[PDB]
Design a protein around this ligand. Sequence first.
Ligand SMILES: CC(C)(C)c1ccc(S(=O)(=O)N2C[C@H]3C[C@H]4C[C@H](C4(C)C)[C@@]3(COC(=O)Nc3ccc(I)cc3)C2)cc1
Length: 354
Amino acid sequence: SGIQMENSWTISKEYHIDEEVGFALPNPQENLPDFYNDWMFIAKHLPDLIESGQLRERVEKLNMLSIDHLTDHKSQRLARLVLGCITMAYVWGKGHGDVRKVLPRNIAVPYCQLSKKLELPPILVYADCVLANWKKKDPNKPLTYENMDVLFSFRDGDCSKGFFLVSLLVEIAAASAIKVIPTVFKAMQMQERDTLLKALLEIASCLEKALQVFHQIHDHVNPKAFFSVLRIYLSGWKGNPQLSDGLVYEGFWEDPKEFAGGSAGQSSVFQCFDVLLGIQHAAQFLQDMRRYMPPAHRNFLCSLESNPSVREFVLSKGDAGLREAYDACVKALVSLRSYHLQIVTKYILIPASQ
Ligand SMILES: CC(C)(C)c1ccc(S(=O)(=O)N2C[C@H]3C[C@H]4C[C@H](C4(C)C)[C@@]3(COC(=O)Nc3ccc(I)cc3)C2)cc1
């Protein structure tokens, strides 16, 4: 394959894709070294600090903390999540138009240095607030909504736990499809009909499960709270009239810089299975959001594109079962796309109408 392999069964660890949670970060770090307690206090108290109007003054009194004591990937990912949440809270405040156009240097410099190390933009992205923003309540119990929590929220009542955790559980459901991908390509190389069929049916089954998990969003997110509260903190400064030149990262760049806020295009799940199934100004935007995924996940998506076409293989075999299994995967992925559009309508377009 174009996919680098660790062994005959498992893809390379260099893709940072976990067998159990997929593109999500496995067992995220929850605590930083004591050195960073001042950052953690602010992030853990964002709801009451934003609500009381205390957040900005608190950030402005922070001392400068070097990033050199964040020595491994998980601590760096946690620090990025912490600093990114503080940054969105600092820029947008309570979300009433009182924006800050300069991010103070004692956040901007460490945030930007950590972002450079991880090759992610210095703005909150999906890999922060969903893929790394979670824990198990009971380590001995499975990955279920009842047994999990987020690490950070923005405002009390913003429904961030529901929005982030349901998204994460969709990613985890997709993980059981991602781990079958090498089997698909081995089965094509070996001309193993049943192996390919069972792989495609498993992928379909897991993507169908992912849609069923996605349906839970309605039980844990209120449309008005999402649109009027949470959406503020997922908004960016690229083409935004409130920050028309972007944000000044004090002490890192002289001039303001534009970075985009959140997009569903930041989940690698869509492109992963679009490419696998051959069903790939919107192209430019799509590729830009790819640069907001972790670089290892970009590399996985690129390796997938270098592989033979599953679609053309299946459609050449005169094999109803293979085609039905392939069609079941296409249907499942299209249903995820359609549901995303339904969520955009109910949680953004309609509330905006009001
Ligand atoms: C407000 C905003 C435009 C960012 C958005 C709108 C609708 C949806 S969603 O509910 O349609 N859906 C959840 C996720 C569930 C399914 C559909 C994909 C999925 C395959 C995993 C979703 C991916 O989620 C995200 O990429 N989330 C995200 C991205 C950046 C940030 I910073 C924070 C969160 C999409 C998600 C986000």
